[PDB]
Amino acid sequence: MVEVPRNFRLLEELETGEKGTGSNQNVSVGLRDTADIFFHYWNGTIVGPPSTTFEYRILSLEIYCDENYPKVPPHIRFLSKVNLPCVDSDGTVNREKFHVFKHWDRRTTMELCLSELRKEMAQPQNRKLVQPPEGSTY
Amino acid sequence: LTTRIIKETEKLQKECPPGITATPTKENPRYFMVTIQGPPQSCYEGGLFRLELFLPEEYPMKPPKVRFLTRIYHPNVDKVGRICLDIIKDKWSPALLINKVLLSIQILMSSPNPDDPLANDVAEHWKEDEASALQTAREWTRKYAKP
C-alpha cells in the first residue's frame, strides 16, 4: 500500500493545523505539550453546534495517539462533561459506538474525528439530550 | 489566537457574569483588563475592582495568571494583588474557562477563606476579630476602589 509511518502522519497533521487559515472555527486540534517531538498528546476543542442543547459550549478534549496510530484510532476523551451516546461515563469516546471508530479508516484525521463528534451533537436524535451545567468536568 | 481563546474572548465580551467585565488589550490579546464590582452587601460593596489577567504559553494546560490591581483588604489577596484561589493554583483543569476563574474571584470576594493553609496577617485578623476586619475592608474599599 505504502504505509505512512506514525511520526510522519503526525507531522502531516501538525502542518495542517499550522497551515490552517482560521476558517473552521467550530473544531480545533493542537499539540498539548510544546516539547514532545513524538506528538503523543493533542488538545481538542469542539464548539457545540447551534440549535442544540450543546450550542456554543466550548468543549475540551484530550487526544492520545499511541504507538499504532493511525493503524488503530486515536484515544479521545472529553474533559468537558457531555451527554452523548458514544461517550462513556468517564468521558471516553467509545470505540464500538462512535461510527468513525467502529468502521475505522486510517485516512481519518484527528480534526475529522472532532468534526464528526460535533455532527453527533447536531443529529436529530441527540440534539435534545439534556446536558450537565455548562462548565462541568468529569 | 487558538480557536478556544477566540471563542472565550467572545464569551467574555458578550456574556460576562453580571458584575464582571473582561477586555483584551490591543497590543496583546492574551492580556485582559478585568473589573469586578464589590459584591452587594459585602464589605466591598460600592467598590469597583480592577484586575489584569494573562493566558500564558501553556494555556490551557496551565491556568490563566490573574491578580488584583486595585488594593483590597482580603484574607486571600496579598499586598501586590496576588490571589490565593484553588482553581488558578492546584485545582486547575484544562476544561475550565476564564469565565469560571472570574466568577470564582467574584465569589471569593463574598466568601473569603481565612483558614487557607498559608498563613498571612489579614487572614489572622479575619479570624481574631472578623467585625474589625470587615470594617477595615470597607474603609479600604472607600479609599482605593472608588468607581
Author numbering:
A (entry chain BBB): 1 to 138
B (entry chain AAA): 2 to 148
The authors write:
Crystals, which appeared after two days from polyethylene glycol (PEG)-containing solutions, were sent for data collection at the Diamond Light Source, with the best crystal yielding a dataset extending to 1.7 Å spacing. Like its S. cerevisiae and human orthologues, UBC2 has a canonical E2 structure comprising a 4-stranded antiparallel β-sheet flanked by four α-helices. UEV1 exhibits a similar topology, but its polypeptide chain is shorter and the prominent pair of α-helices at the C-terminus of UBC2 (α3 and α4) are missing from UEV1. Superposing UBC2 with human UBE2N, UEV1 with human UBE2V2 or the UBC2-UEV1 and UBE2N-UBE2V2 heterodimers gives RMSDs of 0.82, 1.15 and 1.13 Å for 147, 135 and 271 equivalent atoms respectively, demonstrating a high level of structural conservation between these orthologues. The conserved active site residues, His75, Pro76, Asn77 and Cys85, reside on an extended segment of the polypeptide that connects strand β4 and helix α2 of UBC2, with the thiol group of Cys85 projecting out of the catalytic cleft. The interface between UBC2 and UEV1 involves the β2, β3 and β4 strands and the loops following β1, β3 and β4 of UBC2 and the N-terminus, α1 helix and loop following β1 of UEV1. The buried surface area of this interface is 1,466 Å2. The core of the interface contains a number of hydrophobic residues (Tyr32, Phe55, Leu70 and Val81 of UBC2 and Pro5, Phe8, Leu11, Leu14 and Phe39 of UEV1) that contribute strongly to the interaction. Hydrophobic residues are highly conserved at these positions, highlighting the importance of the associated hydrophobic interactions for complex formation. These hydrophobic interactions are complemented by a number of polar intermolecular interactions, mostly notably between the side chains of Glu53 of UBC2 and Asn7 of UEV1 and Arg68 of UBC2 and the main chain carbonyl oxygen of Ile37 of UEV1. Notably, a salt bridge is formed between Arg83 of UBC2 and Glu18 of UEV1.
We show that, amongst others, the E2 ubiquitin-conjugating enzyme UBC2 and the ubiquitin E2 variant UEV1 are essential for the promastigote to amastigote transition and subsequently characterise these proteins in biochemical and structural detail. The UBC2-UEV1 heterodimer, like its S. cerevisiae and human orthologues, is able to form K63-linked ubiquitin chains in vitro, suggesting a role for non-degradative ubiquitin modifications in Leishmania differentiation.
